[PDB]
Design an enzyme around this catalytic site. Sequence first.
Site, PDB file in Angstrom:
ATOM      1  N   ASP A  63       0.770  -1.426  -0.105  1.00 13.17           N
ATOM      2  CA  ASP A  63      -0.092  -0.056  -0.053  1.00 13.17           C
ATOM      3  C   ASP A  63       0.879   1.350  -0.299  1.00 13.17           C
ATOM      4  O   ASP A  63       1.741   1.157   0.661  1.00 13.17           O
ATOM      5  CB  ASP A  63      -1.311  -0.357   1.526  1.00 13.17           C
ATOM      6  CG  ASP A  63      -1.301   0.439   1.963  1.00 13.17           C
ATOM      7  OD1 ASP A  63      -2.541   1.640   1.258  1.00 13.17           O
ATOM      8  OD2 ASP A  63      -0.401   1.404   2.613  1.00 13.17           O
ATOM      9  N   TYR A  65       2.779   4.765   0.218  1.00 15.31           N
ATOM     10  CA  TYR A  65       3.762   5.881   0.669  1.00 15.31           C
ATOM     11  C   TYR A  65       1.743   6.689   1.439  1.00 15.31           C
ATOM     12  O   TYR A  65       0.969   7.414   0.266  1.00 15.31           O
ATOM     13  CB  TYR A  65       4.269   6.921   0.351  1.00 15.31           C
ATOM     14  CG  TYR A  65       5.682   6.663   0.415  1.00 15.31           C
ATOM     15  CD1 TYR A  65       6.228   5.554   1.748  1.00 15.31           C
ATOM     16  CD2 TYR A  65       6.260   6.654  -1.171  1.00 15.31           C
ATOM     17  CE1 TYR A  65       7.553   5.457   1.730  1.00 15.31           C
ATOM     18  CE2 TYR A  65       7.918   6.597  -0.538  1.00 15.31           C
ATOM     19  CZ  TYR A  65       8.251   5.497   0.396  1.00 15.31           C
ATOM     20  OH  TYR A  65       9.606   5.509  -0.024  1.00 15.31           O
ATOM     21  N   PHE A  76       7.638   2.355  -2.899  1.00 13.32           N
ATOM     22  CA  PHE A  76       8.647   2.550  -2.474  1.00 13.32           C
ATOM     23  C   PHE A  76       9.444   4.130  -2.800  1.00 13.32           C
ATOM     24  O   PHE A  76      10.815   4.340  -1.910  1.00 13.32           O
ATOM     25  CB  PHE A  76       9.655   1.910  -1.719  1.00 13.32           C
ATOM     26  CG  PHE A  76       9.018   0.621  -0.820  1.00 13.32           C
ATOM     27  CD1 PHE A  76       8.987  -0.818  -1.611  1.00 13.32           C
ATOM     28  CD2 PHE A  76       9.127   0.602   0.024  1.00 13.32           C
ATOM     29  CE1 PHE A  76       8.345  -1.755  -0.558  1.00 13.32           C
ATOM     30  CE2 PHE A  76       8.138  -0.838   1.276  1.00 13.32           C
ATOM     31  CZ  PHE A  76       7.925  -1.757   1.006  1.00 13.32           C
ATOM     32  N   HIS A 186       8.386  -6.090   6.817  1.00 15.63           N
ATOM     33  CA  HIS A 186       8.753  -5.301   6.092  1.00 15.63           C
ATOM     34  C   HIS A 186       9.841  -4.113   6.562  1.00 15.63           C
ATOM     35  O   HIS A 186      10.139  -3.791   7.548  1.00 15.63           O
ATOM     36  CB  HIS A 186       7.554  -4.271   6.089  1.00 15.63           C
ATOM     37  CG  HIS A 186       7.253  -3.278   5.159  1.00 15.63           C
ATOM     38  ND1 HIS A 186       7.598  -2.098   5.161  1.00 15.63           N
ATOM     39  CD2 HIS A 186       6.607  -3.647   3.296  1.00 15.63           C
ATOM     40  CE1 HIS A 186       7.073  -1.240   3.796  1.00 15.63           C
ATOM     41  NE2 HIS A 186       6.307  -2.331   2.689  1.00 15.63           N
TER      42      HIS A 186
HETATM   43  O1  LIG Z   1       5.438   2.332  -2.465  1.00 20.15           O
HETATM   44  C1  LIG Z   1       5.450   2.294  -1.350  1.00 20.15           C
HETATM   45  C2  LIG Z   1       5.403   3.267  -0.160  1.00 20.15           C
HETATM   46  C3  LIG Z   1       5.256   3.198   0.510  1.00 20.15           C
HETATM   47  N1  LIG Z   1       5.180   2.107   1.857  1.00 20.15           N
HETATM   48  C4  LIG Z   1       5.266   0.509   0.729  1.00 20.15           C
HETATM   49  O2  LIG Z   1       5.128  -0.577   1.055  1.00 20.15           O
HETATM   50  N2  LIG Z   1       5.614   0.559  -0.584  1.00 20.15           N
END
Ligand SMILES: O=c1cc[nH]c(=O)[nH]1
Length: 228
Positions: A63, A65, A76, A186
């Site tokens: 999910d 940011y 990310f 994570h």
């Molecule tokens: O793309 C993203 C941004 C934040 N956190 C996540 O897991 N993925």
Amino acid sequence: ANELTWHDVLAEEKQQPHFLNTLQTVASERQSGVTIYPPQKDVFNAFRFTELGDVKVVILGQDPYHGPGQAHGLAFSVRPGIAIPPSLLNMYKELENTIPGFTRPNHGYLESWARQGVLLLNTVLTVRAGQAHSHASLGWETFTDKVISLINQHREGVVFLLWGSHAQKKGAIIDKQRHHVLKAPHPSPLSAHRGFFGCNHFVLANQWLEQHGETPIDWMPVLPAESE
Ligand SMILES: O=c1cc[nH]c(=O)[nH]1
């Protein structure tokens, strides 16, 4: 395998209920004022940068940011004028304790990553705002589910950087006699400290690429483009 573009592979899917009834869940709340990340035109951004064929590695988060200006669709990544957030910081940390002479960059734009068969993905393609998950009951996990499948079905010997419980299921459908699969809690500062930090996804992936003839991944990001 022949040259099958996502256009080809997603099709039907696109044209399907469950999904449609997820765009709808989406379109809607954005519509009730509620701020949602990332803007709609950015939602699938991933599939845009890295095509199924060119798929070498798959990073699966879940999910985006939930911050302002953060989310741009790259599992990310951030655009250039933005500040690397916890998660990427940590990535980098790993990109420090493990790669040779790696020095984090002074940006969080991972375009280069993508351009090199890295499937920077997430399971839940959209999100409320500063409210984690907050959108994991819609057809999101269902979409991505297929996305992997498709990947699986196609392209041989793929490493699946599967970060987080959530990401870990929705990717654990992959026939391993044919694909590579790694598990790391994570990276997020809320979990990193549980194994993420220690995993070796980066190298461990650059190996798999090595031993099948595959050019490793330059985990060193860059902010190109310049002219007068
Ligand atoms: O793309 C993203 C941004 C934040 N956190 C996540 O897991 N993925």
